């Protein structure tokens, strides 16, 4: 037969926005200025994921470990 890793089987991707804070609910056309605005709530890793809760110093080590983490936009009728 045929197998292999394909996933990736979503036909609409809805994610939060591009840059936006998770503390307050503020959004940016930047993520340079949300970076720095984060800091207002704390002085740490300028990345943090939600469903763990956990914080990266690199991205690609978020941008990975997003994985451990579905990851498929909400459907509706
Ligand atoms: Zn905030
Ligand atoms: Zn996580």
Redesign the pocket.
């Given at each position: 037969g045929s197998s292999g890793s394909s996933g990736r089987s979503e036909w609409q991707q809805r994610e939060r926005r591009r840059y936006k804070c998770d503390e307050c609910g503020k959004s940016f056309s930047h993520s340079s200025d949300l970076s720095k605005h984060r800091r207002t709530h704390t002085g740490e890793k300028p990345y943090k994921?939600?469903?763990?809760?956990?914080a990266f110093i690199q991205r690609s080590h978020?941008i990975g470990?997003?994985r451990?983490?579905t990851g498929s936009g909400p459907s509706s009728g």
């Open positions: 994921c939600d469903e763990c809760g956990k978020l470990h997003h451990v983490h």
